[PDB]
């Protein structure tokens, strides 16, 4: 029993909602593509003088490239930011 | 004598669920992310053994630099497949 202790979908079915079941399974795939943002989508745009700027290709992230970079600042007018918040919220298991 | 004057599509009352406006906007919000993460995360690779190629970040989609955009295959192992499914949501490509 148990099954899900280190698996990415045992099998499941299809033809129900947009994200397979979506009532539960939606979060897994959504955060996966959202993580791709940090994977390679985020990078520095080159300067004209001789340097760069730390910017998301929209507004999902932006800050002086040599400033922290850990909690990179977000402009919430961009749909890229919601993705960050989704994966930060995550499915919560409340137990003591 | 006349037809419409005010936009009654002003109804702003989406449920406060997991995926923000999870009822119909659920598909919208995620598609926003999928659309942005695709368009702004494509690197054009210049090859000395070939030429300039249009290749998406995770290699999940590749198209001639002439850019057709619509007709592009899918790397089945790459999470690009689900991203496409989300941002498209339209009956296209059977891909056997």
In words, what does this structure look like?
Chain A is α+β, with helices and mostly antiparallel strands. Chain A has helices at residues 26-41, 79-89, and strands spanning 43-46, 52-55, 62-63. The first copy, chain A, has a three-stranded antiparallel β-sheet, with no helix packed on it. In chain A, strand 1 and strand 2 (52-55) form a beta hairpin. In chain A, helix 1 crosses helix 2. Chains A and B meet through helix 1 and helix 2 of A and helix 1 and helix 2 of B.
Write a short abstract of this structure.
Chain A contains two helices and three strands.
If you consult CATH, what is the topology of chain A? Helix Hairpins
Count of DSSP strands of chain A: 3
The interface involving the most residues is between: A-B, 25 and 23 residues
CATH class of chain A: Mainly Alpha
Assign an overall shape of chain A. Answer: elongated
InterPro entries (chains A, B): DUF3222 (IPR021599), ITPase-like_dom_sf (IPR023104)
Protein name (chains A, B): DUF3222 family protein
Organism (chains A, B): Rhodopseudomonas palustris (strain ATCC BAA-98 / CGA009)
Pfam family, one (chains A, B): DUF3222
Present the secondary structure layout.
Two copies of one chain form a homodimer.
Chain A: H1 26-41, E1 43-46, E2 52-55, E3 62-63, H2 79-89
Antiparallel strand pairs in A: 1-2, 2-3
Key features?
homodimer, 96 residues, alpha+beta, Helix Hairpins, three-stranded antiparallel beta sheet, 3 strands, 28% helix, DUF3222 family protein (chains A, B), ITPase-like_dom_sf (chains A, B), DUF3222 (chains A, B)
């Amino acid at each position: 029993m148990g099954s899900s202790h280190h698996h990415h979908h045992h099998s499941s079915g299809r033809e129900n909602l947009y994200f397979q079941g979506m009532t539960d399974t939606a979060a897994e795939d959504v955060r996966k593509i959202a993580t791709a943002l940090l994977k390679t989508a985020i990078e520095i745009v080159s300067e004209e003088d001789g340097g760069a700027h730390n910017q998301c290709k929209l507004c999902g992230a932006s800050v002086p490239w040599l400033q922290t970079g850990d909690e990179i600042k977000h402009a919430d007018d961009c749909p890229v930011v919601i993705a960050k918040q989704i994966l930060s919220s995550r499915p919560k298991l409340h137990a003591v």
